[PDB]
Each structure stands twice: as C-alpha cells, then as structure tokens.
Symmetry: C3
Subunit: 488 residues, 3 copies
C-alpha cells in the first residue's frame, strides 16, 4: 500500500501580504478595511438631529428659520452645507469653541429669566430678521435701546441658585456710525462688563461701516459666560448690550456635531461618518477620518486582506505545504488535511478532522481578536477646515495626520505578521499530521519524501482506517513488513 | 528499557493571551501593568514642594498665606485641591500659561529692583488681603495711587544688564466706578504700556462692578513680560498700574507641577502620580495618565500577563508540548525538561539542564528587554480640566486620548506576540531534546510516538546516564539491539 | 561515504538585536537609521528660496533689504539665523500664524490696487527704513498722515471680482506721544475697522514710548485679512492706518519654510533637514525631527541593524544552525548552505543553490518592504522655539515628543521581530535541506546527529552529485547498503 498525506487547495485563491512576500496566494482571506458606506445616516441607535437649513449656533441664538429647534436635544447634530444665516448679521469670536461646547452638551434647553431692564426699550427688531411677516430678532436675545432719549446705566444680577451650570449667551451691537450710536443708545461711549465671582468679560463697541448684509452695515458680536452653582451673573452696561433672555443648560455627555449632506434613514448602525453609516465588524475603515460612535479606526489603505487559510498550491518555515508535499488537493472539499491511499482494494481519499479543526480553531482565534472589536468615540476635534487660520489649525491637522499614519502602520504590520503566522501554523499542522502518521507506522513503512509512505504489508480498507483513526497496531504486521522491507 | 522525554507542569498555572488564544494556561507569568500606588508621594529623588493652601500663582504674587514660599525652588510643585486665594480678587488672562511657565522654571527666586515711581503714593493696601492683623497686598506687587490728588504720568525703565532672562509680574486695577477711578488715580482714563525692544503690551482698565469678593467689587488683572539680556523694560502709565517690585529668575529645567491630595512621605520612588508614587519596574501602568519622573506608560488595560513558562499541561507549532507528549510532569521540580526511564534496575526521573537553561535564558532575555526600562518625562500637558474651554482643550484631550489608545494597542500586541513566541520556543526546546536523543540512539531504539523510546538492549543506570550526558556509544550495543529489533 | 550538511559563516559578523537577545551575531546586517547629512541642502527637486538676510515676513512687507524677493515663489523658503529686520520697528500679533500661512502658500506674488485715499498725505517715510540713500518705508505698505492739518475719515472698498482669495496686509501706527498723535493724524483718537461680509477687525492705537529701535520709540502692529471671491474689503478709518497697496495671492500647495544655516548646493535629494539633505533609502533617521520632502521617519535611536544573514557561527527554534550543526563553514563562499563529503575519490564541498536562494529571496522580500519606502511630508508644525509661550507651545512640543516615542517604539519592535524571524527562517532552511537529503537516502544511510550522514555503500563523485541534484535512486544501492548496515 501507499499512504499519502496532503492538504486541500482551491482553484480561486486570494493574494495577501506577509513579512517576506508582497504577494502570496492563500485559500481564503477576509477584508479588514471597511471601504463603503450605505450612503445614509441610520437614525438608530444614536439620536440624530437634522439641522436642515440651520447651523447649531443659529438654532442656539433663535434665527427665525430655526424656531423648530427650541429646546431640542441630540446625540449627534447634523449640520448641512446648504445652511445659511438669515437674521441680524453677527460674528462670534471663537465661534468654533461655542459650537463645540453646545455640540457636546447635546441640548438647546432654555430657561427664561426675568431681568430688571429699568429705563430702556426692549425687544429691538430688524428687517434683516423676519419672523412672521414682520421685523424680528434672535429669539433668545433682547435688543435694548434708549427710552425717551435716555439710556440709564444697567446693573443687574442673577444668582445661580441651581445645582447645575448656566450658559448665558449675550452680545454687543456695533453701530455703523456715531450718529446711529447716539440715536440707539443716547450715548457716545457704550461699554459692557459681564462678570461672576470667577470671571469677567468687558467689551466696548467698535463703530464703523461693515459691508451690508440684508441691508445692515451694523454688526453684533456674540459672547458667552458660564455661571457655576452658588455664583452670580452681574451685567453692568451703559449701552450697546444685546441682552440674554435666560440661560441654556450646559450638560456633559457623549453628544457631538458632524457636517454631512447624507440623508437620514430608518435603519440601525453603530458607526456614523459624513458619508453615511458604515458597518463596524472590521477593525479598520478608509471611508472617513470623521466618525461618531463605535467605529473602525481610519487608515490610509483601501484594502488589507487577512489570510484565513493555508498557502494555496493548485492541482513556510515547516517545509511541508509548498514543500515536500508537491501540491494541494482541489478534490478534497470536506477537510483541510487528509490521506490518499492505494491498496489492494482500490484508491481513496479521507479528510483528517483533528488537524483540520486545529488549523481552523487557531484562525478563528485570530478572527475573534480582530472582528467586531471596535472602539467607541464621541465628540472629537475638527478634521476639515474651510478657512486658513494658522497655528492652532496647523496643530489640529498635524495631530490627525500623525495619528492616521500610526494607525495605518499598525494595520499594515498587523496583517503582515498575522498572515506570516497563518501560513506557518497551517504548514505546521500539515507537518504534524505527517509526523504522527510516520510514528504510527514504526518499522512497517518508509517515507518516500513526497509526503507518501510505502507500507510494506497488505493494508486493506480496515487497515487504512485503523491508521486514520489511530488504532493501528504495528505489531500485527511487523513480521510481514520487515520481511518485505529487508529482502535482497 | 524505555526512555521517555517530558517537561514539567504545575498544579496552579496562569492564564495568558496569545495571537490565537484569548485564554491559555502557562506554568508562570508576570504582570506588565502597574495597577497600584503606595498612596504617598515619596520625597526622594525629586525635590517636592507641598503647596498646602497655596496655588503656585498665589505663591508667585505673594498672597499673605504664602509668605513661606518666598524664593523656594522645586522639581515638582504639588498643588492641593483645598488651596484658595485670600488677597485682592484678581484674574490672569491665560492663567494656565503663567502657571505652566513658572512650574517648569522651578523657582520663585525674586530680585528687588528700584523703580522711580515719582509723584505717586506706593504700597496701596486692602482688607481683602490681611497680612499680620492689618490691610496688606500681594508682596511682590506695588499698588500705586494719587499723591496730593495728582497722578503724574509714569515712564520708567530697567535695562536687563544680566546674563539671564527676567520675568516681570505686573497688573492693572479695574475700579468698580468712575468715582473710585477718580479718587484712586485722579484721572478718568488710565492706560498702561509695558514694552521692550522685542515686545509691547498695552492695557486699559475696564470700569464696572464685579460681584464682591472679601467685600471688593473691584478687580486686578495680572500680566507678565520676559526681558531678554541686553533688552530694556519700559513702563509708561498714567494710572491703574499695579507695579512690579522686581523680577523672578526664569530658568529652563525639568521642573513641573501636579494637582494631588496625596500626602508626602519619607521614601524613595522615581515615578510620581497624583495617586502617589508607583514602582517603575513594569513597562506599563494603569494608575494615572498624569505622571512625573521615570514612569511606566499609561494604558487602559488593568492587567497584561507575560508568559514566563511553557504551556501548562497538568498530570504550539512544534507539536511536542500538548502534542505527541501527552502531558507535563508535576513531579519534575528541578528542571523544565527531562527524562523518565524504566530499565532492569528500576524507574527514575532526571532533569535536562542544557535544554532547561536554553528556555530560561530566552525568557530572561525577553524580560530584560521589558522590565526596568521606563522612560523619563517631566513637564507635560494638562490632562484634567475643571471648566469647559472649547477648541484648545478639545485638542489637549484628543492628543492624550490618541496617545493612550496607541500605547494600549502597543501593549496588547506586544504581550500577545511575546506569549505566542514563548509557547513556541518552549515547545521547540522540548522537540529539540527529543530529536537529539533519538539521534543518539541510532538503530538501537524506536520512537513509540508518545515521546518515549523503546531501547532494544539492556540499558542499566550507567547506560541511561550515558544517554543523558551524551556519551552513549551506540556501537557498543548495536549488535544486541539489531538482534532484538529485527527478530521474527 | 560521509555526507555532511552545513551552512556558511564569516570571520567578521555583525551584532543585532532580537526578541530574546540584546546582542547576537549574524553574517550580515543593514542599517535602518540614517544618521548623517551631506551638510548641504540640495536644490533639486524642491525649489529652494534662500532668505539670506531676510525673514519671510520682511520679504512680505517689503523691508528694503528684501526688494529682491518681490513676487518670488518657493517650495521651501529657507530662513537664516543671521536674518534681521531693518525698517520701521513693528510687531505682528500671531506672527507665527502669518509666517505659517505665507510659507505654505509658497508665493509673494503681489497685485497693486488703487485705493481712494482722499484728503490724506501718502507715502510716509522714516530714516529707520533706508532704501536708496533716503528715508523709505515697507514697499507694500502706505503710511497715511494729515494733509493741511486735516485727516478726513477714510471709507474705501475693494470688491474681490477675482476667482481666488486675496490676502491683504495692513497695519496700525502706535505713536509714542499724544503730541506725535496730533501732529501725524490731526486727531486725538484714531480708530481702524477693516471688514468683509464674513469678518471684521477693529484696532485702536496705543500711545506711549517703547524702547527706541533705529531711533524710533513708535511702533507699527501688522494685521491681515483674507477676502473671498464675491466679497468686499471695506476699510473705514479716522487715523493711524498703515494702508495696503494691494493684495497677495494666497495659494494652497506643498510649500513650507525651514530655519537652517546649511548652504544650498547643486545636487539632488528628496529629503531636506536643517542640517542638510539626507538620503531617504532607509525607513528611519536620527538627523533631525524637522524635515521636508519624502523623508525617513525621525527616531531617537542612532542605529538599528536589520539582519540580512543567518546566525554567524565561526569555524533558533529549528535547532540546526548553532544546534546539531556544530558550526558554520567560512570556506564556503559561493552559497549559504551546502554539502561536504568524503568518499573513495576524496573530500569536497558544494553549495546548494535552491536553499540558498530560498533564504535570500525571503530576506530580499523583507528589505523590499522596508527600503526606499519613505513617506512625503510638507508644511508641518514648528518643532523648535526661541521663546517661552505657554499652553499652545506646550501642546506643540508634547505632540511631537509623543509621535517620536511611538515611532521609536515602532522601529525598535520592528527590527527585533524581523531579526528573530530572519534567524529562524535561515535555521529552518538549513533544517529543510537536511530533512530532504535524509529522505533521499532512505535506508542507505544513517544520521550521525551532527548534520552528517554515514552512507553505507560506495558513493563516488557521480553518486554524491546525484544526491545534490536530487536524482539519486536509492534502489540502486539498497542491497549493498542494507548488507553493510545490518551486519553482526
Ligand atoms: C435708531 C434708528 O432708527 N436709526 C435709523 C435712522 O433714524 C434717523 C431718522 O429717524 C431721522 C429722521 O427722523 O432722525 C434721526 O435721529 C434724530 C432724532 O429724530 C431726534 O430726535 C434727535 O434728537 O436728533 C437726531 C438727528 O440725528 C435718526 O438717526 O435713519 C436711518 C435712515 O432711515 C436708518 O437707517 C436705515 O435702517 C434700515 C434698517 O432699519 C432697522 C432694521 O434693522 O430693520 C429698523 C430697526 O427698527 C432698527 N432697530 C432698532 C432697535 O433700532 C434698526 C437699527 O437701527 C439698525 O439695524 C442698527 O444699525 O434699523 C436700513 O438699514 C436702511 O439701509 C437704513 O438707511 C436708521 O435705522
Ligand atoms: C480711594 C478710596 O479710598 N475710595 C473709598 C471711598 O472713598 C470716598 C470717601 O472717602 C469720601 C468721604 O471722604 O470721599 C470720596 O472722595 C472725595 C474726596 O474726599 C475729595 O477730596 C474729592 O475732591 O472729591 C471726592 C468726592 O467723590 C471717596 O471716594 O469711600 C468708599 C466708602 O467708604 C470706599 O468703599 C469702601 O471700600 C472698602 C474697602 O476699602 C479699601 C480696601 O480694599 O481695603 C481701603 C483701601 O485702603 C483702598 N486701597 C487703596 C490703595 O486705595 C481700597 C481701594 O480703594 C479699593 O479696593 C478699590 O476698589 O479700598 C469696602 O470695599 C467697602 O465695601 C466700600 O464701601 C472706597 O474704598
Ligand atoms: C509728524 C512729525 O514730523 N513729528 C516730529 C516732530 O515734529 C514737531 C516739530 O516739527 C515742531 C517744530 O516744527 O513742530 C511740532 O508740531 C507743531 C506744528 O509745527 C504746528 O503746525 C502745530 O499747529 O502745532 C505743533 C506743536 O506741537 C512737531 O510735533 O518733531 C520731533 C523732533 O524733531 C520729531 O521726532 C524726531 O523724529 C525722528 C524720526 O523722524 C521721522 C522718521 O521716522 O524718520 C521723520 C519722518 O518723516 C516721520 N514720518 C512721517 C510719516 O511723519 C516720522 C514719524 O513722525 C515717526 O516715526 C513716528 O514716530 O519721524 C527721530 O525719531 C528723532 O529721535 C525724533 O526726535 C518728530 O518725528
Ligand atoms: C462707507 O462706504 C460704503 C460704500 O462703499 C457705504 O455703504 C454703501 O452704501 C450704499 C448706499 O448708501 C448701499 O446701497 C451699499 O450697499 C453700501 N455698500 C456696502 C457694500 O456696504 C457706507 O455707507 C460708507 N460709510 C459711511 C457711513 O459713509
Ligand atoms: C454700572 O451700573 C451703575 C448703575 O447702577 C453705573 O453707575 C451709575 O451710572 C449713572 C448713569 O451713567 C451715574 O449717573 C450714577 O452716578 C451711577 N450710579 C452709582 C450708584 O454709581 C455704572 O456706570 C455702570 N457701569 C458700567 C460698566 O456701565
Ligand atoms: C451693581 O449691583 C450690585 C448689587 O447687585 C451692587 O453690589 C452689591 O452692593 C451691596 C451693598 O452696597 C453689597 O452688600 C453686595 O454685596 C453687592 N453685591 C454683589 C454680589 O456684588 C453694586 O454696587 C451695583 N453697582 C453700582 C456701582 O451701583
Ligand atoms: C508716558 O510717559 C510720559 C511722561 O514722562 C507721558 O508724557 C507726559 O505726560 C504728562 C502728564 O500727562 C504731560 O503733561 C506731559 O506733557 C508729557 N511729557 C512729555 C515729556 O511728553 C505720557 O503720557 C506717558 N504715556 C502713557 C502711555 O501713559
Ligand atoms: C520715557 O523714557 C525714555 C527714557 O528711558 C525716553 O526715551 C529715551 O530718550 C532719550 C533722549 O530723548 C533717547 O536718546 C533714548 O534712546 C531713549 N531711551 C530708550 C531706551 O528708548 C522716552 O522719551 C520717555 N518718554 C517720554 C515721551 O517722555
Ligand atoms: C467711516 O467713514 C465715514 C467717512 O466716510 C465716517 O463718517 C464721517 O466722518 C466725518 C469726519 O469725522 C464726519 O464729519 C461725517 O459726518 C461722517 N460722514 C458720514 C457720511 O457719516 C466714519 O467716521 C468712519 N468711521 C471710522 C470707523 O473711522
Ligand atoms: C466620503 O467622504 C469623503 C469626504 O468628502 C470623501 O473624500 C470620500 O471619498 C468619501 N468616500 C466614500 C467611500 O463614500
Ligand atoms: C431651506 O432653504 C431653501 C432655500 O432658501 C428653501 O427652499 C427650503 O424650503 C428650506 N428647507 C427647509 C428644510 O425648510
Ligand atoms: C488614581 O487617581 C485617578 C484620578 O482620580 C483615579 O480615577 C484612579 O482610579 C486612582 N487609582 C488608584 C489605583 O489609586
Ligand atoms: C489651610 O487653611 C485651613 C482652612 O482655612 C486652615 O484651617 C489650615 O490651618 C491651613 N493649613 C495650613 C497648611 O496652614
Ligand atoms: C542636526 O541639527 C540638530 C539641531 O541643531 C542637531 O542637534 C543634530 O545633532 C545635528 N545632527 C547632524 C547629524 O548633523
Ligand atoms: C547681510 O547682512 C550682513 C551684515 O549686516 C552684510 O555684511 C551682508 O552683505 C548681507 N548679506 C547679503 C546676503 O546681502
């Protein structure tokens, strides 16, 4: 009889990378880089708020377009690129910081407070800000002006008797002219001091024409202040104050904001990107560096294939597969390793289950460490910028670029080591089954060197089966075998 | 005779992770993550300065509570969370930067300088700042006011004739009212310009009530300026100047500051955390991301076990351990690998020293690369924040979170590769001792397949010993062995 | 006959590090850390602009020294440490940001625009700024002052009808005295508002003596503003305006700036450092963390040797090299593995080509992954600082230090894993050639255990050659061999 040890092969293998080889074919691999989105943001499990035409900041101030956003909450606020401001023209010094802190607070919940604006007109309006047919203003702000050509210095307080922090949004009006300055606040100067036991902010208006927006050459600047529990807001002004009508709760949670034009859909997905949700089964993704939720890590590579089978040899350090075994057996489809024999009763093929299962368990082990293991991230840094800003933006970008190169490196190295190891462990399993069989045969057979043993005795099907199920008793055939082997 | 090769096992193994296995038992492991502190800051080798009730900044300005800190130096300044300000109410725009640069300078050494404050009253005092029973002020600052209802414009210089940089601390007073403005500085305006050949800073006071602190509704703002050698300080003011009384040396060294409530103790420890000192023998730690000194790197994992022994098989790619050798020998306690025999004189067990020492040396090699190898870090970035700040704080936190995920990744991968390698190299040593023995026996013995040889000749204790010490001469027994082996 | 399998050795090996060994000798290694520069900046392929005596900013404003830089472009602008300002004394709030954004724009291209400066004197001059024998000014700036003791409020526009962004550089003059204030701008106040539909910047001068520079106690502050296509610049001022004479194009490309005192040379090199160009064949470098172009990654290690040959054993997990083969063959110089024999015709040595080529191909595979693979980087963050700045600088440095430790870690681990693997794969190749030969010999030879076979039949040179070329037919000699082997 002849008993040959072998392993399977497939007609259609896959190319992977190892430590030593850019391009080597295995029987099977799996992709570790997610490269597509379904192109929609799934609305489960994260609570999504579609900004539509409104920026977060405009929803905050109460631009008329944004009245539907009053007191809303979100896990992720989605800002659309078509969003536009449609109220009094304003800027926010350190706009990105205000956006950021509201985003991660995750709420626009507002509470009215009663201020003693003694001696001034309230509820200033503008046709740059139309609410319902008429001149209006930011819903959360209170434009104060002269009453009877008098603007009597303001000096109001508001203790924080609450358990939580209050966020106050206020402003300063910059009139285009000294004339408008006078006719608005009956006063040439105009000064604002807003303070607490912990902080002070002081602002003087800057008079001058700015280019007209909805016919307004004047401008408002927006500021904010956080009042801790037991502290006190004190607003001391003699003109130009755009006053708050109350406070926002400021919370600390996992909320964020993302710029995206992707539609919201009724589906479930843990990981969100501007492009849409992406599955998070893979450890890496190449869809977008901007992400929210439990997401694969962003890498530069568009693909990284993890070998999930042995080297494919159609028809490693252990020397068996692609070694002393000339090639794989495509006809073996019920196992990874097995036996072909020829004896007096014919020629046959049988899978070896234990060795097949050993290789598969090791590979499944690798997969369990790498698949469905992603990390959860929420409010991050900004990663795209529409305007040159210099030093801080240079650092923001450098930090992300650094991080991405390091992860891309981790990904490349991980797959190469794992693949080299997969090829070696599968080669080893082959070598181990061969060795175990050789030992079973003792003096009754000889290694032909091509993975085949010549067995020097009659070995019928039951005899072959006794080898494969490891009950073969070499003593039974020894006399016969030694006589055939050692003749002249 | 029968000669069996084997390896040890222990009743109580340890679970470790490898590339292929989340949970596999070895004979021994070591922990690579430091997870506890002694709960005290050891006062050797770093020179520790306990801030007690004083912030660094208050020690800098000379709050009365902090007189004991005059001219002190430190490697690490420890700020306590109970610290509180107890002098005139002040703020420092960019407070964190001033704190940071004094911290890393490591000295409060001060040098008096004589300024020509011609025509003003000096040494302004407040009951918000009590020194010894009476109204006082920041020791390092000089509150100037009117003399005889005159405040004559100040214009003073101070060349830096020194070899080193000078740090000047100064301020501007913000009176609550135009009345107090007048009664203090006999002047409505008030302006400050402090300049050098290299820089200029200009400040106007902002009049208005802030909430009262120790009954003061006024406030001081603190500023600083660094004067290079050969440069000149020029202070040009017509009111509101809180003047310097001299300069601080500004040094560049390894000094830092840390917020901690841990007590200082008389002991020695290279690595300090807010929780207390931690040993630095391990390469990683999970105690605190804030550290000072030669410290293990912070990771998320609470434990990472490095295998320091073979797979434990009570009673790998090489197929010997947990392979053709059915199990380990718990009765073998003087070696890792060895021999059990049965011959005419009895049954015995002996360790093999060379193979045991080969496995141990390799493992010790790994340990020497990983143990006691920690990296020294001093003044870092801040890693905890008591207040929402936006953009820069978002970047500070993102940088640390990024770094920590990358190191945690490094740690996880390192231990898995090392453990897989440890299991393989110990399996290999087993396989190598088996092969070497088989070769010694030549034609005189046969491999039974379970790590045991059947020796076909009388092999007494000396004979067994000749095998183990590698002096066995197969020629001596060949005739006898061939006759027993190849009979019918 | 005797047939011995062996491998080469060299008299002069190299020490490398592995996972288990700090110091182990191989036949050959290669250096992975570039540690030297040619000490010159090569002027191909990057377009280099030598700043000589001029900072970028001075070339931007048009300091007289810098007239040769008008409208120049660059890939890399090189600033020399001897550079000095020689015009009116000025500062730029956020200087580093302006430098940065011009650097990466890569152009000083300027376009004259005609402003309507109605009612003022133009072309203000100073002896602090000498052009051609006479008092001059920044070429790109326009110092406006009173005309006939009148300074009539300015209010000019300039639409951006272009397709691209415009960068405007402007300033505010700070006179030393209220007197000079009057005599310059016929006005006590002085205010500047520069605005667009997107932004507003407002500046008031700060009067006061600063220390004299080229006899000027006054100072200019420089500001900038970017005007998007379809937007409008509006400059509204009543004094102190240092006006623009036009705009710079602001581009987005790969341009940067570097501080260096290295001379420019006529040579070609992809990677530039302040020290000079460095070859980029190696994956790592220790020359400078500041780099431009396709550059090896900066690491702390001064050397990292990658094994490119087997363990050197003069005269691993597979047990062959430095194992059952007592030592290497220094006399074998045409191959890595081979055969020595003694037969009736003499004693000889022959290389085995297939096994030699297998080891070499694997090693070349590793090298191809690591050599000539460097990554291209352009404008980065700053990495050296001449002045204490606090929080942002602390983050800039912390980010770079973090990155460098992570890459140094990657480098150390990479070389140790690769070297351990190289030693194992070369040991394996040895073991594989031995096994294949043993199998060829079948029952005709015995393993002596030291890598040598005793062949039990007459085996002349052709016979030896049949073994080495794998045509040996064991059946031919079997009878003879069995008779010699199994005699009494
Ligand atoms: C406060 C104000 O309304 N300013 C007006 C301005 O008003 C002048 C005009 O009424 C004349 C004739 O009566 O009188 C001047 O004042 C005299 C006053 O009668 C007298 O009592 C005093 O003693 O002496 C002075 C002499 O100076 C007034 O200065 O007139 C111009 C031209 O009509 C207005 O500009 C136009 O504004 C348009 C936008 O209008 C609003 C808006 O935003 O919708 C109307 C808003 O109700 C008003 N909101 C508030 C709270 O006031 C705002 C607000 O003033 C601005 O937005 C701030 O910039 O303006 C549009 O811009 C058009 O292009 C302008 O020509 C100016 O608003
Ligand atoms: C500079 C000053 O002392 N301001 C006082 C203020 O003084 C007024 C009062 O003396 C009246 C009666 O004489 O006269 C006013 O001035 C007139 C002046 O006599 C006359 O010559 C001139 O021609 O015309 C004016 C008319 O206006 C003075 O304005 O009085 C109030 C009420 O007493 C004081 O407020 C109280 O201050 C308390 C804190 O006191 C200190 C402190 O900090 O401890 C005392 C310090 O010595 C003083 N330090 C210095 C260098 O001045 C400081 C300092 O002024 C403030 O800290 C700055 O804010 O105040 C406490 O706050 C209490 O709640 C207040 O009612 C005010 O200090
Ligand atoms: C604008 C100016 O030139 N300021 C001069 C200043 O001029 C005074 C002087 O002319 C006297 C005598 O005629 O008159 C004063 O004005 C009177 C005026 O005649 C009258 O019509 C009005 O009604 O009443 C006033 C009464 O005050 C003038 O104030 O004189 C001083 C001393 O000479 C000058 O300081 C010296 O400047 C030197 C540097 O000179 C330049 C320069 O930078 O090179 C000359 C430049 O041409 C000038 N550039 C422009 C656009 O003006 C600049 C510029 O003023 C400064 O740089 C801004 O600081 O100065 C040098 O610094 C020397 O150390 C000074 O003593 C002052 O420049
Ligand atoms: C400063 O100049 C601008 C013109 O460049 C003035 O604003 C323009 O005024 C006209 C009619 O009054 C408007 O129809 C334009 O829309 C305005 N232009 C822009 C783009 O804002 C401005 O009024 C001038 N300043 C003063 C106070 O005289
Ligand atoms: C802060 O508020 C108080 C008003 O309560 C201001 O002081 C008053 O201002 C009025 C009108 O300008 C003066 O005529 C009074 O003499 C002041 N009253 C008192 C009690 O002093 C003060 O101007 C405000 N300050 C700011 C920053 O606007
Ligand atoms: C502005 O308002 C506050 C009151 O809200 C004034 O400060 C208070 O004054 C009383 C008595 O004068 C003190 O006992 C309180 O401690 C003060 N309150 C706080 C929390 O600061 C302030 O004086 C007013 N401003 C002016 C100048 O009129
Ligand atoms: C800087 O210092 C000088 C004083 O040495 C100031 O100029 C003087 O100010 C006085 C009093 O206000 C005037 O009456 C004199 O005419 C000025 N003397 C000279 C020599 O010019 C100047 O005001 C100070 N500037 C600042 C920023 O406070
Ligand atoms: C404020 O003081 C400085 C002197 O410390 C004055 O500037 C000096 O003036 C002399 C002669 O006028 C010059 O030769 C020096 O070079 C100046 N010193 C420096 C270092 O700037 C300044 O003029 C004074 N201010 C005023 C307006 O009186
Ligand atoms: C912006 O420009 C306009 C000038 O076009 C300024 O307003 C004029 O200023 C003059 C001179 O000071 C006044 O006498 C006129 O009454 C104003 N003209 C108009 C049409 O209002 C305004 O001062 C400038 N503002 C700034 C910021 O300098
Ligand atoms: C996703 O969005 C980014 C940003 O626009 C884009 O560059 C990327 O190609 C998109 N990718 C996919 C797979 O949709
Ligand atoms: C958003 O604005 C556009 C154009 O101004 C308008 O046509 C559309 O109806 C608005 N959409 C929403 C979400 O109301
Ligand atoms: C150390 O301090 C940090 C910060 O408070 C805390 O979260 C951590 O659990 C503490 N750990 C130990 C081991 O003392
Ligand atoms: C710190 O302040 C507390 C409470 O104000 C006081 O009881 C204690 O004595 C002070 N401790 C020191 C270190 O002086
Ligand atoms: C290169 O420049 C840096 C910065 O001065 C210096 O520290 C380094 O040693 C220099 N190295 C070489 C190899 O020229
Ligand atoms: C640069 O300035 C120095 C010293 O001021 C001068 O000698 C030299 O000629 C200048 N060099 C150039 C590049 O013009």
């Amino acid at each position: 009889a002849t008993l040959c040890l072998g392993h399977h092969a497939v007609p259609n293998g896959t190319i992977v990378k190892t430590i030593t080889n850019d391009r080597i074919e295995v029987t099977n691999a799996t992709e570790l880089v997610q490269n597509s989105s379904i192109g929609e943001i799934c609305d489960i499990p994260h609570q999504i708020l579609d900004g539509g035409n409104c920026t977060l900041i405009d929803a905050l101030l109460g631009d008329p377009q944004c009245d539907g956003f009053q007191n809303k909450k979100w896990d992720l606020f989605v800002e659309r690129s078509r969003a536009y401001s449609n109220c009094y023209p304003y800027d926010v010094p350190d706009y990105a910081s205000l956006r950021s802190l509201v985003a991660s607070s995750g709420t626009l919940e507002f509470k009215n407070e009663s201020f003693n604006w003694a001696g001034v007109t309230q509820n200033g309006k503008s046709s740059s800000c139309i609410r319902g047919s008429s001149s209006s203003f930011f819903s959360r702000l209170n434009w104060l002006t002269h009453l009877n050509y008098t603007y009597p210095a303001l000096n109001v307080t508001m203790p924080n008797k609450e358990q939580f922090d209050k966020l106050y949004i206020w402003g300063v009006h910059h009139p285009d002219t000294d004339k408008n300055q006078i006719s608005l606040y009956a006063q040439p100067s105009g000064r604002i001091t807003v303070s607490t036991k912990r902080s002070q902010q002081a602002v003087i208006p800057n008079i001058g024409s700015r280019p007209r927006i909805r016919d307004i050459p004047s401008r408002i600047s927006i500021y904010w202040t956080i009042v801790k529990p037991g502290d006190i807001l004190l607003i001391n002004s003699t003109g130009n104050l755009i006053a708050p009508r109350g406070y926002f709760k400021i919370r600390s949670g996992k909320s964020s904001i993302m710029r995206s034009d992707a539609p919201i859909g009724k589906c479930k997905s843990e990981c969100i990107t501007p492009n849409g949700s992406i599955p998070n089964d893979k450890p890496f993704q190449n869809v977008n560096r901007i992400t929210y939720g439990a997401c694969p890590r962003y890498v530069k590579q568009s693909t990284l294939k993890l070998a999930t089978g042995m080297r494919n040899v159609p028809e490693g350090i252990f020397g068996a597969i692609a070694g002393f075994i000339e090639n794989g057996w495509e006809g073996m489809v019920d196992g990874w390793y097995g036996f072909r024999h020829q004896n007096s009763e014919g020629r046959g093929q049988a899978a070896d289950l234990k060795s097949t299962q050993a290789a598969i368990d090791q590979i499944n082990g690798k997969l369990n460490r790498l698949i469905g293991k992603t990390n959860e991230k929420f409010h991050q840094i900004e990663k795209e910028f529409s305007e040159v800003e210099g030093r801080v933006q240079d650092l923001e970008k450098y930090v992300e670029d650094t991080k991405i190169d390091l992860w891309s490196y981790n990904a490349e190295l991980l797959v190469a080591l794992e693949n080299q190891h997969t090829i070696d462990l599968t080669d080893s399993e082959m070598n181990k089954l061969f060795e175990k069989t050789k030992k079973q045969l003792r003096e009754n057979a000889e290694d032909m060197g091509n993975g085949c043993f010549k067995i020097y005795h009659k070995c019928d099907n039951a005899c072959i089966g006794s080898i494969r199920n490891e009950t073969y008793d070499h003593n039974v055939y020894r006399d016969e075998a030694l006589n055939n082997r050692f003749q002249i």
